[PDB]
């Protein structure tokens, strides 16, 4: 067969030959509480598809970034929202010619 | 390697005498008074450093504490003793000489 | 008996017959040239002795005599430096005033206006201010006269002629057999007892009898003309017993083991001499006595002809683990069979040693008035750092050459080398990941600081003020070595260096050495150092482990060590060879050590070097390294643009040649890019369109003009790149530090 | 001569394990198997890395690339003077014989193998690329 | 010494000799006629 | 797959086949330029494009000619 | 000189993984097998929820203690939690497009488990399985970021 006498190639066992192994994967079904599994299977039902999750991402992200520009960058008190709060570098156009 | 077809689970040959004897062979000699310590010992000063640093428990030791020196030397010798003890035990048990 | 002299009488006849026939050493080039590539191959294969023949005996003889020639050349160079310090120097003037007079030992002839290079160095002299530190070395030897330099030069020329006679002898007249070279036990026993043990013992004797009294009197203000000559300190014991009363006891305290009586000239002072700014010569004398004893007992370790001792084969063969298979078996055969395996290890450790030297010569300046010659100190760090990096790259090279040529898989079955080649993918993958991790977390820190300070957010930088990454481990080690004489080295009067902390030693107003603080900038640059080192290691080690085979090319060993590519196939296989990995490791060695020496220069000019005139240490750049070197714009502005003011304004002054070699080095570096960016096939067609014009005018040569090889193009490019970059840095460094330091 | 069937009962050389072996290409696309009958136990050089000990008699060895198999083929043919023959194995179990596709090695004639991809003109008698323009795909004048 | 003089006839030795001679000639010209910018004499 | 074409200047020296690391080329008898052998490229699906073959061809320029074409796993030397 | 530790993977010296203590020590293999990534029998949505909770709770810390608003007292945790929410959303989009890209071929080769018993293929490595895995990842990541904010709000020794 495969595992004995150093016969490392068998046509009837191509998984052991090629190396298609699960080094750490176990197939046990008893992990999570069924109340918790029900909760988190139901909480993801509306997004368990590709296009629907991409729709949620698009909606939530467009909304988050738009409201970031509208209120969030102000609530974060970003300097770009406050403005210069001074005259600025207006009159110092150059060391020689102090342009506006 | 015609042998070793399963990666044995006892890859380290554990004899519980080894850690005990390494702790004993390093720490008991680590409690011998030398005049460089002022009549005290490395391990005694180490336990004293841990006692002083346990007083202000949340904050950690300083940089000029002299606790780190004792810790690092004690653990250097300790890890070397335990390592060589495991090596010697599994060299006497196995071949290698 | 086993270990003995074994030579052949008159193996090779001494004649110029093979001088008239170039390419004689190979079977391919001895037929003569037809293309110009022959002219390059004649030089590339000149010292490739292991391809001229297969027998290790003839290769070994060639190597031995070649080493003799290198030694003779080194002796010529040493004698030349001593001679230039004897005839063309201000040494006797510098000894009287070493804090004011600039060390110079190269006079320029006044031919085309280069008499401007004969600068006003001091002592009524006009020449080029040297930075090799020979004056400090000679003062530390106790020279005090140009005649002694003259006779040392003549002795060096005698010894050079002796070395060349020795090479001729040991090749042509009496050349040793292979079983003589293969006595590595004897070679190590002798190179440890007699070469490094007896050499250090003899140098200790000189340091006891010549350097210590002469320098003790030099430090006591005595004029070098009225100091007793060394032979007078040998014969007249009264002078020495006046200087050190333990010389009144003779050599009895040694044979009675009352060694503490010798505590006048064998000390453990530590720190620096306050009057010279260098290490105590009594400390160095005791040092060399000690390591001489140590090496002389280390040279009695291996077994040669009397059963006592060790067999290196037995140490190696009995060192094996459960993780490592058979262990070091077959390595004795590897290293007693391959010259390249030896050369790899030797170059690696020799270059790491040269960098050890660079780091240990500035923190512990061994020579009087070395630390206060900031040019000599900077040059001596930079030079040995560069030599070390080059040697390390060559170590990777010759490891690869071993793996290609001298590797035999029959000798190496499940030994350590086989087990490395078997999991080279793990090795190189983890090395790649750490190189990426370090590149990010070491350079993106600099980019983060650039972005923050450019955006006007200095509170978000990685600095000693905003987000501190303090190097707490190195700081703890500094404090552990500063407090060492109090607890962990009670017989030391001071620490080894003042860089650990404490008081500064300032000599002549200039700071010889002072504590070195480390902060966030030092953290970042040290991690940059480790990053670049790890990438160079990645390249060279990947060239070593994949020198025989890879998942791309499984037959790379048959292709060779030095080949350009297998083809454009497999998507493209250029620079798959183990030679091209060295070619790239050269670039990364340059990139690493440029930053190393930049870190050195800036840290020294900002936080160590300076003057104390009033109450206060005024450094050269004012300590900007702490706050300015968080950014790449910092190294631009305050190092590469600020410290370039001395090299680009050097025109019309004594340092103008430094500016010239600045510009010319910028030329050569960029010229390298003609060879690195391009490829042979363009130049061959350009060359043949030129050969058409030569044929038309009947001036086409018989030796057909070819473009350089691909490998040769890469070699020329890396050579010009390294030369130009290193010489640009050399000019910049020296022009800066001769002026401001 | 007839096409040999791959024997899976053939043992493998004594190898202690490497990291240069098979990847997911073996499980997904293809891999290769080289066989040879040895007269003795000789430590040869694996193209993946490291040295293995061939067994006295028949050997068998897996590789993820045909170039690996032919590298070992030339190594066993030139340094050991053997006559190996390798295949191409697909993950579904299909075996395809590859190297001595007619029985004899390709540098030797076999008196009956057909000449393929032979242009019966000189290399300078190829047409200009303007004549093979707009032939569908981008096509060399050698066609 | 026919072979020795053949060696001195090689390309690099002849180039060294010839360029040493040329450079020395130009150097001695520039010593005895310092700073020759134009053809005035 | 790359395109390997072999022209009638082949003198049949077998060097292109001995150099080929992928067993793409073979020597066919007399059904080519002349008698006394000839080369051929029947297994170009395995050609990577290394041009060892035309590196070893001794004729004027190269009787064997590799024209780099579309790439694949077999034509990119991938073990993955 | 016996008792060699390093072995080839599953005894096969030609596959190239070299079973090693870091790879296949009992405790290490036990820990890696117990991770929700390698629970090939449980639904991928729940393993995604668990993985996402972990990753959304850990990656709030950096944005909190090192973000641009790290120094304003109360705005820091809010800002870092919103940043971690955005990053979790980005990662969920990444997972969705990865499920679109990868799972189209259904490779026919089987899977064993280093002991011979031919286990089934993980339903996670299917288009629907990865869709529900990314759904669980989004839900669990946003919940974990929210709870990281909560733990900054309620934990006693939160400095
Ligand atoms: C390619 C551009 C270029 C040009 C046009 C020049 C031109 C000149 N340079 Mg500049 N120079 C250049 C590049 C150039 N240089 C470079 C790249 C460098 C850096 C290395 C320099 C560095 C440099 C310096 C440092 C100096 C010059 C000098 C000179 C002058 C030399 C005049 C001389 O030697 O009289 C020679 C006059 C002759 C008549 C000799 C002609 C040659 C032969 C011998 C004539 C044949 C006669 C006879 C038949 C021979 C007998 C045969 C024999 C075998 C017996 C001249 C203005 C010098 C100067 O003062 O400049 C103003 C000077 O000091 N140059
Ligand atoms: C599980 C025990 C424990 C706990 C709760 C802490 C907790 C803390 N440590 Mg301590 N520390 C520990 C173990 C611990 N450390 C150990 C084992 C070492 C060694 C250190 C060394 C250490 C240093 C060197 C420092 C801290 C500091 C700190 C504080 C910031 C982090 C925090 C209160 C820092 C501080 O607040 O001071 C600090 O500078 N720790
Ligand atoms: C590393 C070896 C080395 C190097 C680089 C130099 C370099 C130099 N030497 Mg020194 N020299 C050396 C070894 C060396 N020397 C030794 C070993 C001796 C003893 C024989 C001398 C004796 C010596 C004298 C006596 C003089 C020099 C001079 C010079 C300068 C010009 C030489 C010249 O134009 O020759 C021309 C060479 C050919 C035409 C060929 C140059 C800086 C000269 C100098 O600096 O004058 C100020 C000078 O007068 N050298
Ligand atoms: C004058 C005396 C003499 C003579 C006639 C010979 C004759 C011979 N030797 Mg021997 N040899 C001699 C001295 C001599 N040797 C010495 C002193 C050494 C010790 C270094 C050797 C070491 C030696 C070895 C190891 C080998 C020979 C070989 C040979 C043969 C050819 C060498 C050749 O091609 O020379 C022409 C070569 C040169 C002129 C090169 C000289 C290189 C010198 C030493 C260093 C110069 C470096 C220079 C400073 C760099 C400047 C850089 C520049 C850019 C400015 C021939 C039988 C070879 C042999 O037998 O192979 C069959 C061989 O392998 N010789
Ligand atoms: C006490 C004995 C002794 C000493 C001092 C040395 C010293 C040396 N050996 Mg070693 N060697 C020895 C024993 C010794 N060897 C034995 C027993 C063997 C046989 C196994 C070898 C085999 C050996 C090889 C194979 C090679 C050396 C090399 C070297 C030189 C390395 C260059 C260096 O470090 O620069 C330091 C330079 C000096 C200290 C300069 C002074 C050199 C003095 C004059 C010679 C040393 C004494 C000499 C060995 C005894 C013979 C004297 C002579 C008059 C007969 C160095 C001079 C290498 C070398 O450079 O080749 C030339 C080299 O390739 N040796
Ligand atoms: C290799 C290292 C070295 C050397 C060469 C010397 C050499 C010397 N030391 Mg120093 N010394 C050294 C290391 C060295 N020392 C170290 C490391 C220490 C620290 C422990 C000292 C500490 C020290 C002290 C404290 C003193 C010396 C003294 C001396 C001198 C007396 C030698 C003596 O009595 O020994 C005896 C040696 C011999 C008997 C050997 C003599 C061999 C002769 C030359 C044989 C040759 C004859 C020949 C075969 C035939 C003749 C040829 C021809 C005329 C026909 C001598 C100059 C003393 C001195 O004079 O102070 C200045 C002294 O007081 N030394
Ligand atoms: C102890 C030191 C040492 C020794 C003995 C050797 C010995 C050898 N090396 Mg190794 N090597 C070393 C250090 C050393 N190397 C270092 C430091 C590096 C990194 C640069 C390398 C990198 C290296 C590579 C990459 C290769 C070798 C090769 C070789 C072999 C032939 C070298 C040859 O023929 O060149 C003859 C000499 C030359 C061609 C001259 C080189 C010209 C230099 C670059 C000019 C620039 C130098 C100059 C100082 C700058 C000023 C220029 C000025 C003139 C204008 C030989 C066994 C080759 C080999 O074995 O492959 C088969 C090979 O491919 N070496
Ligand atoms: C400035 C020029 C430059 C740069 C940036 C790099 C960068 C790199 N080289 Mg290359 N290299 C260069 C010049 C350069 N090289 C030259 C001139 C040579 C000589 C031939 C080489 C030769 C060479 C070799 C031989 C090797 C490398 C390797 C590496 C990598 C190691 C560092 C790393 O991964 O850190 C992480 C990346 C960086 C530090 C690059 C800067 C990125 C910063 C941090 C910002 C990131 C931006 C961020 C993602 C935002 C994106 C914005 C969005 C709009 C896209 C990296 C990709 C090694 C490698 O690939 O193995 C690890 C390797 O083996 N290089
Ligand atoms: C560095 C610490 C590595 C960990 C360590 O302590 O290694 C120590 C470990 C023990 O090796 P052995 O004692 O079996 O080797 C005996 C030697 O004499 C070589 O035969 O070395 C290895 O297994 C190979 C190298 C591991 C390299 C791992 C790098 C991560
Ligand atoms: C410029 C260049 C060339 C062309 C360089 C030519 C071929 C040679 C350069 C000069 C040679 C050395 C001629 C110099 C003169 C001769 C030494 C003969 C002396 C004659 C008198 C000048 C004394 C390449 O062949 C090449 C190949 C691969 C990668 C990059 C490049 C590349 O960048
Ligand atoms: S390119 Fe390489 S693989 Fe293709 S036919 Fe030519 S030699 Fe063979
Ligand atoms: S190498 Fe060239 S000439 Fe020789 S057989 Fe091949 S194609 Fe023909």
Domain extents in chain E? 1-41
Instruction: Specify which residues C424 forms β-bridges with.
Output: none
Domains of chain C: residue spans and CATH: 2-741 (1.20.1130.10)
Pocket of ligand 8, candidates C428, C431, C434, C439: which has the most ligand atoms within 8 Å of its Cβ, to mutate?
C439
Cα–Cα distance for residue pair D78/C722, rounded to 1 Å: 42
Cα C476 to Cα C464: distance, rounded to the nearest angstrom: 17
For residue C421, give the nearest of D44, D49, D64 by CB distance: D49
For chain F, the domain total comes to: 1
Q: Which candidate, C631, C627, C636, C637, places its Cα nearest to that of C606?
A: C627
Q: Which of D11, D17, D52, D64 to mutate to test the interface with G (most CBs of G within 10 A)?
A: D17
What does the angle CA C598 – CA C604 – CA C609 come to, to the nearest 5 degrees?
A: 150
Q: Does D47 touch chain C (CB under 8 A)?
A: yes
Q: Is C460 on the interface with G (CB under 8 A)?
A: yes
The span from the CA of C380 to the CA of C359, in Å, is: 10
Residues 6+ apart with CB under 8 A from C338: C402, C406
DSSP readout, C544-594?
HHTSS--SS-TTHHHH-SS-SBS-S-TT--BT-SHHHHHHHHHHHHHHHHH
Mention every residue, 6+ apart, whose C-beta is less than 8 A from residue G143: G49, G52, G53, G56
Please name which of G136, G121, G137, G130 lies closest in space to residue G102, comparing C-alpha atoms. G130
Cα separation of F72 and C570, whole Å?
9
Alpha-carbon gap, residue C343 to C405, rounded angstroms: 14
Q: Which residues of D touch B2 (CB under 8 A)?
A: 14
What value does the CA radius of gyration of chain F take, rounded to a whole number of Å? 12
**Rounded Cα–Cα distance for residues G113 and G136 (Å):** 26
Long-range contact set of residues C53-60: C-beta below 8 Å, sequence gap at least 24: C55/C178, C56/C178, C56/C337, C56/C339, C57/C177, C57/C178, C59/C339, C60/C176, C60/C178, C60/C181, C60/C339
SS3 category, D87: strand
Residue nearest to ligand 8 atom 34, measured at CA: C436
Give the count of alpha carbons within 13 A of F64, CB side only: 34
- Specify which residues C343 forms β-bridges with: none
Domain that holds residue F55: 1-80
Resolution in A: 3.2
Experimental method: cryo-EM
Q: Determine the Cα–Cα distance for residues A19 and A34; give it in Å rounded to an integer.
A: 35
Q: Which DSSP string corresponds to F47-65?
A: -----HHHHH--SSS-SEE
Find out whether F13 is annotated in a ligand binding site. Answer: yes
Q: Which bound ligand lies closest to the C-alpha atom of F24?
A: 11
Close Cβ partners of D114 (under 8 Å, ≥ 6 residues apart): F28, F31, F40, F42
Pocket probe for ligand 9: among C316, C319, C320, C321, the residue whose CB has the most ligand atoms within 8 Å is: C321
| Pairwise CB contact (< 8 Å): G6 & C323 | yes
Rounded Cα–Cα distance for residues C105 and C88 (Å):
5
The number of angstroms, rounded, from the C-alpha of C430 to the middle of its chain's C-alpha atoms is 29
Residue-wise burial string across C155-173, b where 16 or more C-beta atoms lie within 10 A, e elsewhere: ebbebbeebbebbeebbbe
Structure-block tokens of residue G96 = 């969705």
β-bridge partners, D85 = D35
> Contact at 8 Å (CB) between C40 and C708?
yes
Q: If you ran DSSP here, which 8-state letter would residue F60 be given?
A: S
Long-range contact list for A85-93, CB < 8 A, 24+ apart? Answer: none
Instruction: Please report the sign of the dihedral spanned by the C-alpha atoms of residue C443, residue C449, residue C452, residue C455.
Output: negative
Q: Which atom of ligand 1 is nearest to the CA of E35?
A: 60
Contact D8 A7 (CB under 8 A): yes
Among residues C438, C468, C445, the alpha carbon closest in space to that of C632 is found at C445
Q: Contact at 8 Å (CB) between C542 and C585?
A: no
F19 lines ligand 11 (CB under 6 A): yes
Dist. CA C632–CA C462, nearest whole Å: 13
Q: Could you tell me the two tokens for C145? A: 């006269």
Regarding beta strands C510-513 and C505-507, do their DSSP bridges make them parallel or antiparallel, or are they unpaired? antiparallel
- D43 to chain B, any CB pair closer than 8 A? The answer is no
Looking at the complex, does the CB of residue G16 fall below 8 Å from at least one CB of chain B? no
The residues facing G77 across adjacent strands are: none
The minimum CA-CA distance between D40 and chain F, rounded to whole Å, is 26
Angle between helices C710-740 and C656-676 (to 10 degrees): 160
B54 near C CB under 8 A: no
d(CA F13, CA F38): 8
Torsions phi, psi for A72 (to 5 deg): -75, -40
Candidates A10, A46, A57, A73: best to mutate against G (most CBs of G within 10 A) is A57
Residue of the CA atom closest to atom 12 of ligand 7: C394
The residue whose CB lies within 8 Å of the most ligand 3 atoms, and thus the one to mutate among C73, C78, C83, C112, is: C83
Instruction: Mention every residue, 6+ apart, whose C-beta is less than 8 A from residue C436.
Output: none
- F59 and D CB contact within 8 Å: no
**Can you give the residue ranges of every domain in chain D?**
1-143
* Among C497, C521, C366, C541, residue whose Cα is nearest residue C442: C521
Q: Say if residues C409 and C549 touch (Cβ distance below 8 Å).
A: no
Contact F8, F31 (CB under 8 A): no
Give the closest residue to C103 by CA, choosing from C115, C92, C111: C92
* C-alpha of residue F71 to centroid of ligand 12, in Å: 25
SS3 C313: helix
- CA dist., res. F42 & res. F27, Å (int): 10
Q: Are G91 and G99 a contacting pair, CB within 8 Å?
A: no
Cβ–Cβ < 8 Å for B65, B56:
no
Q: Is the CB of C584 under 6 A from ligand 8?
A: yes
Ligand 2 centroid to residue B47 C-alpha, Å: 18
CB contact under 8 A, B4 and G26: no
CA torsion sign, C494 to C497 to C503 to C507? positive
First-to-last alpha carbon distance for chain D, in angstroms, is: 34
Helices (H) and strands (E) in chain G, counts: 6, 0
Please, are residues D80 and D42 in contact by the beta-carbon 8 Å criterion? yes
The Cα A28–Cα A46 span in angstroms is 27
Q: Does B34 touch chain C (CB under 8 A)?
A: no
G142 is in an annotated binding site: no
Structural contact between residues C113 and E31, judged by C-beta atoms closer than 8 angstroms: no
Q: From the CB of C329, is ligand 9 less than 6 Å away? A: no
Interface-testing mutation among C406, C416, C421, with chain D (most D C-beta atoms within 10 A): C421
**Strand partners for C98:** none
By C-alpha distance, the chain C residue nearest B36 is C487
- Residue among G16, C419, C418, G28 at smallest CA distance from G8: G16
Q: Which CATH number fits the domain E1-41, given the four candidates 1.20.5.510, 3.40.50.300, 2.40.50.320, 1.10.3720.10?
A: 1.20.5.510
Determine whether the annotation assigns residue G54 to a binding site: no
- For residue F26 the two structure tokens come to 């073979």
Do D18 and G9 count as a contact with CB atoms less than 8 A apart?
A: no
Instruction: Evaluate whether G109 touches D30 at the Cβ level (below 8 Å).
Output: no
CA atoms C477, C482, C486, C489: torsion sign? positive
């Amino acid at each position: 067969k495969y595992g004995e006498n150093s016969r490392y190639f068998d046509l009837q066992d191509m998984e052991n030959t090629t190396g298609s192994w699960d080094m750490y994967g176990v197939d046990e079904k008893k992990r999570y509480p069924d109340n918790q599994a029900k909760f988190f299977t139901q909480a993801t039902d509306i997004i368990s598809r590709r296009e629907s999750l991409r729709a949620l991402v698009a909606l939530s992200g467009i909304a988050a970034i738009v409201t970031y520009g509208l209120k969030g960058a102000k609530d974060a008190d970003l300097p770009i929202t406050k403005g210069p709060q001074t005259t600025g570098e207006n009159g110092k156009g150059g060391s020689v010619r102090s342009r506006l | 390697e015609a042998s070793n077809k399963s990666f044995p689970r006892d890859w380290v040959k554990t004899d519980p005498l080894v850690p005990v004897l390494g702790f004993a062979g390093w720490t008991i000699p680590a409690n011998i008074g030398v005049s460089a310590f002022g009549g005290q010992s490395l391990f005694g000063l180490f336990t004293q450093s841990i006692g002083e640093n346990l007083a202000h428990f949340p904050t950690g030791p300083a940089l000029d504490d002299k606790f780190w020196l004792y810790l690092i030397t004690y653990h250097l010798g300790l890890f070397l003793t335990i390592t060589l003890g495991q090596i010697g035990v599994q060299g006497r048990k196995q071949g290698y000489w | 008996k086993k270990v003995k002299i074994a030579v052949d009488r008159n193996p090779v006849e001494t004649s110029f017959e093979k001088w008239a026939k170039p390419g004689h050493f190979s079977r391919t080039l001895s037929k003569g040239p037809n293309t110009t590539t022959w002219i390059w191959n004649l030089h590339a294969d000149a010292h490739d002795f292991d391809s001229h023949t297969s027998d290790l005996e003839e290769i070994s003889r060639k190597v031995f005599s070649a080493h003799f020639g290198q030694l003779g050349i080194i002796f010529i160079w040493l004698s030349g430096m001593y001679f230039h310090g004897a005839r063309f120097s201000n040494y006797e003037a510098w000894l009287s005033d070493p804090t004011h007079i600039k060390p110079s030992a190269q006079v320029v002839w006044p031919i085309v206006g280069q008499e401007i290079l004969n600068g006003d160095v001091g002592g009524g002299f006009q020449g080029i201010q040297i930075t090799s530190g020979f004056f400090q070395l000679w003062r530390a030897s106790g020279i005090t006269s140009e005649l002694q330099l003259y006779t040392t030069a003549i002795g060096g020329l005698v010894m050079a002629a002796a070395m060349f006679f020795a090479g001729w002898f040991h090749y042509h007249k009496a050349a040793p057999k292979l079983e003589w070279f293969q006595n590595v036990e004897s070679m190590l026993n002798h190179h440890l007892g007699g070469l490094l043990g007896l050499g250090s013992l003899a140098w200790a004797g000189h340091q006891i009898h010549v350097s210590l009294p002469v320098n003790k009197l030099l430090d006591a203000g005595v004029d070098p003309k009225e100091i007793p000559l060394p032979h007078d300190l040998l014969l007249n014991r009264a002078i020495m017993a006046d200087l050190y009363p333990s010389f009144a006891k003779g050599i009895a305290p040694f044979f009675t083991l009352n060694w503490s009586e010798y505590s006048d000239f064998l000390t453990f002072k530590g720190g620096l001499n306050p009057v010279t700014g260098g290490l105590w010569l009594s400390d160095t004398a005791h040092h060399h006595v000690a390591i001489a004893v140590l090496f002389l007992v280390a040279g009695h370790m291996y077994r040669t002809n009397w059963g006592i001792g060790h067999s290196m084969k037995e140490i190696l063969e009995a060192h094996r683990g459960p993780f490592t298979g058979e262990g070091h078996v077959g390595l004795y055969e590897i290293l007693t069979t391959s010259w390249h395996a030896q050369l790899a290890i030797n170059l690696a450790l020799f270059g790491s040693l040269s960098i050890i030297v660079a780091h240990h010569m500035y923190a512990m300046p061994p020579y009087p008035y070395l630390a206060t010659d900031y040019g000599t100190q900077l040059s001596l760090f930079t030079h040995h750092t560069w030599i070390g990096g080059f040697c390390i790259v060559g170590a990777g090279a010759h490891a690869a050459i071993f793996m290609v040529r001298d590797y035999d898989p029959t000798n190496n079955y499940n030994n350590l080398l086989d087990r490395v080649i078997r999991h080279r993918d793990a090795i190189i993958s983890h090395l790649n990941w750490v190189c990426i991790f370090l590149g990010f977390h070491s350079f993106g820190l600099y980019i983060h600081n650039d972005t923050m300070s450019a955006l006007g957010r200095p509170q978000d930088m990685f600095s000693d003020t905003a987000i501190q990454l303090q190097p707490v481990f190195a700081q703890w080690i500094q404090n552990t070595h500063f407090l060492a004489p109090q607890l962990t080295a009670p017989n030391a009067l001071a620490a080894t260096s003042l860089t650990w902390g404490g008081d500064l030693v300032a000599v002549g107003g200039k700071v010889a050495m002072m504590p070195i603080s480390l902060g966030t900038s030092d953290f970042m640059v040290h991690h940059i150092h480790a990053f670049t080192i790890h990438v160079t290691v990645l390249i060279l080690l990947k060239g070593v482990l994949f020198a025989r085979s890879s998942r791309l090319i499984p037959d790379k060993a048959n292709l060779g060590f030095r080949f350009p590519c297998d083809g454009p196939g497999r998507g493209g296989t250029c620079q798959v060879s183990a030679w091209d990995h060295v070619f790239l490791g050269l670039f990364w060695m340059y990139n690493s050590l440029s930053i190393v020496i930049f870190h050195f220069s800036w840290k020294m000019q900002s936080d160590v070097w300076g003057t104390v005139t009033a109450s206060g240490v005024s450094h050269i750049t004012g300590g900007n390294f702490a706050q300015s070197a968080n950014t790449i714009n910092g190294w631009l502005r305050d190092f590469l643009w600020a410290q370039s003011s001395q090299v680009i304004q050097s025109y019309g002054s004594a340092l103008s040649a430094y500016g010239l070699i600045f510009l010319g080095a910028h030329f050569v570096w960029a010229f390298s890019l003609m060879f690195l960016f391009s490829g042979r096939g363009y130049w061959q067609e350009l060359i043949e369109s030129i050969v058409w014009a030569h044929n038309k005018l009947k001036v086409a040569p018989a030796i057909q003009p070819r473009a350089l090889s691909i490998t040769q193009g890469r070699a020329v490019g890396v050579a010009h790149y390294l030369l130009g970059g290193i010489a640009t840095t050399w000019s910049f460094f020296l022009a800066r530090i001769i002026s401001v330091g | 001569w007839t096409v040999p069937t791959l024997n899976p009962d053939t043992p493998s050389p004594i190898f202690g394990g490497s990291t240069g072996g098979l990847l997911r290409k073996a499980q997904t696309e293809e891999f290769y198997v080289i066989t040879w009958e040895a007269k003795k136990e000789q430590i040869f050089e694996m193209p993946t890395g490291g040295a293995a000990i061939m067994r006295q008699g028949p050997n068998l060895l897996k590789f993820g690339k045909k170039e690996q198999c032919l590298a070992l083929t030339t190594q066993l043919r030139n340094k050991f003077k053997l006559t190996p023959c390798f295949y191409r194995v697909f993950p579904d179990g299909k075996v395809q014989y590859l190297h001595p596709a007619d029985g004899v090695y390709p540098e030797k004639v076999n008196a009956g193998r057909v000449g393929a991809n032979q242009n019966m003109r000189r290399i300078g008698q190829n047409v200009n690329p303007i004549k093979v323009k707009f032939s569908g795909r981008m096509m060399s004048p050698a066609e | 010494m026919k072979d020795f003089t053949t060696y001195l006839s090689t390309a690099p030795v002849i180039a060294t000799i010839w360029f040493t001679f040329t450079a020395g000639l130009l150097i001695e010209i520039n010593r005895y006629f310092p700073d020759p910018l134009v053809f005035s004499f | 797959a790359h395109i390997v074409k072999i022209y009638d200047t082949c003198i049949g020296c077998t060097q292109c086949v001995r150099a080929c690391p992928l067993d793409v080329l073979e020597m066919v008898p007399w059904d080519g330029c002349k008698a006394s052998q000839m080369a051929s490229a029947p297994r170009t699906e395995d050609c990577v494009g290394c041009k060892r073959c035309e590196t070893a061809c001794p004729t004027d320029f190269l009787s064997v000619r590799v024209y780099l074409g579309s790439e694949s796993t077999r034509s990119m030397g991938l073990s993955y | 000189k016996k008792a060699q530790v390093i072995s080839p993977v599953n005894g096969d010296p030609f596959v190239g993984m070299l079973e090693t203590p870091v790879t296949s020590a009992p405790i290490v293999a036990t820990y890696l097998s117990n991770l929700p990534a390698y629970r090939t029998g449980v639904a991928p949505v729940l393993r995604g929820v668990e993985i996402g909770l972990a990753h959304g709770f850990l990656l709030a810390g950096p944005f909190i203690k090192l973000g641009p608003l790290r120094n304003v007292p109360e705005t820091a945790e809010i800002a870092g939690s919103l940043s971690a929410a955005g990053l979790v959303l980005i990662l969920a989009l990444c997972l969705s497009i990865y499920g679109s890209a990868q799972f189209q071929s259904t490779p026919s080769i089987g899977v064993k488990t280093l002991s011979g018993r031919s286990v089934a293929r993980d339903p996670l490595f299917s288009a629907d399985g990865w869709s529900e895995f990314a759904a669980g990842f989004l839900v669990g990541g946003e919940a974990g970021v929210a709870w990281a904010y909560v733990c900054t709000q309620i934990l006693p020794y939160y400095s």
